[PDB]
């Protein structure tokens, strides 16, 4: 019957708890910081806000995170939490009523009080948290400062242009990518319509990201197994500038390298992260392997150009260092993984839904999983410092 499945899961859960016990006992040696915090509801999203505040005389600083909720069924919110970090406790500070679970939430670089969210609906909402109360209304009525239309279904991908203030890209399960320019604010239009719609993909579009230097370029990835590079200056929106057979399965994420304008990374259901050179996309630079299941998020370090991290379904977050590619290993070491695999974070015991590198404290990461856990952590300095 179906019984074999619930029993096989429970055996798996038992192995998972054993491994967790071992990891926990190992943390004093692997980490200069590990904070575990159980959220009320799981968050599907996490992103550090750009601001830090460092009180005079004090031995910590205060940082903040955009999170969201994912209730079995109860009122859903968009969240801003604060985090106190030791210097050289986690508290919910703002809750905003939200129509369904927050699939993803991202702040506008040019104005961090502005936050876009993706929903179970086709609508892409926009909120400005300074225009809302800290304490949400007990009604649970979601009043968004904007409401963007263009999609027929939900998705995950969401990306603000860091060079053109208010240009928002979005990916959907409808196979399309929509662009909005919310800079064209009306007095109170309170609903916008999509400036452009890109239709090159032939399946669910999992992610989209603006290039960080060139305001006209963006990349998208999809369940058609393709990476596509789009120039907003071309007039053809049904055919990208470049289209690559990126992976042997669904492509769930991409990230542009913040120091190298030609280098990007994609992560896949094929259990690999691929490295790309935009000047010759016909040829993959490298394939990072070690993950045991589908990869859903990939993020370059904001401080270290050769450092990349990836997470997914296998409950692991891996950190990679490109500069170790091709180095020779003993056979004992090669059993553990390729030489560019620098760290495996084993702190989680369920699927990792999102993570974010702290932009103010080098090496600090926040990762969130499906079992409500949020971890903020930093690997031991001798791991990377040599």
């Amino acid at each position: 019957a179906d019984k074999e499945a619930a029993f096989d899961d429970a055996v798996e859960e038992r192995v998972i708890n054993e491994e967790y016990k071992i990891w926990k006992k190992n943390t004093p040696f692997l980490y200069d910081l590990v904070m575990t915090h159980a959220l009320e509801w799981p968050s599907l999203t996490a992103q550090w806000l750009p601001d830090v505040t460092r009180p005079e005389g004090k031995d910590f600083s205060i940082h903040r995170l955009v999170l969201g909720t994912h209730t079995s069924d109860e009122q859903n919110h968009l969240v801003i939490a604060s985090v106190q970090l030791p210097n050289d406790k986690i508290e919910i500070e703002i809750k905003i009523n939200h129509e369904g679970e927050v699939n993803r939430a991202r702040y506008m670089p040019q104005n961090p009080c502005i936050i876009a969210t993706k929903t179970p609906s086709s609508d892409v909402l926009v909120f400005d948290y300074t225009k809302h109360p800290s304490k949400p209304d007990p009604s649970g009525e979601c009043n968004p400062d904007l409401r963007l239309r263009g999609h027929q279904k939900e998705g995950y991908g969401l990306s603000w242009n860091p060079n053109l203030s208010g240009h928002l890209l979005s990916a959907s399960d409808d196979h399309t990518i929509c662009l909005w320019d919310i800079s064209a604010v009306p007095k109170e239009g309170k609903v916008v319509d999509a400036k452009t719609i890109f239709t090159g993909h032939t399946a669910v579009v999992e992610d989209v990201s603006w290039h960080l230097l060139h305001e006209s370029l963006f990349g998208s990835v999809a369940d058609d197994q393709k990476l596509m590079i789009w120039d907003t200056r071309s007039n053809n929106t049904s055919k990208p500038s470049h289209s690559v057979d990126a992976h042997t399965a669904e492509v769930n994420c991409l990230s542009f390298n913040p120091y190298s304008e030609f280098i990007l990374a994609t992560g896949s259901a094929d259990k690999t992260v691929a490295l790309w050179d935009l000047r010759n996309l016909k040829l993959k630079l490298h394939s990072f392997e070690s993950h045991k299941d589908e990869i859903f998020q990939v993020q370059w370090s904001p401080h270290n150009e050769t450092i990349l991290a990836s997470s997914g379904t296998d409950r692991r977050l891996n950190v990679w260092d490109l500069s170790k590619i091709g180095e020779e290993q003993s056979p004992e070491d090669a059993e553990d993984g390729p030489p560019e695999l620098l760290f495996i974070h084993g702190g989680h015991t369920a699927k990792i839904s999102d993570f974010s590198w702290n932009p103010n404290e080098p090496w600090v990461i926040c990762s969130v999983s499906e079992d409500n856990i949020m971890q903020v952590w930093q690997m031991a300095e001798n791991i990377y410092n040599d």
């Binding site: 070491d333 553990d336 620098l342 791991i383």
Partner: peptide, 22 residues
């Protein structure tokens, strides 16, 4: 040097194995 950086780097890639304190 109960624990070397080298054994720490190796442990970084084996998080589910207990760290050997020799």
């Amino acid at each position: 040097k109960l624990l070397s950086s080298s054994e720490t780097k190796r442990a970084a890639r084996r998080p589910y194995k207990p760290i050997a304190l020799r």
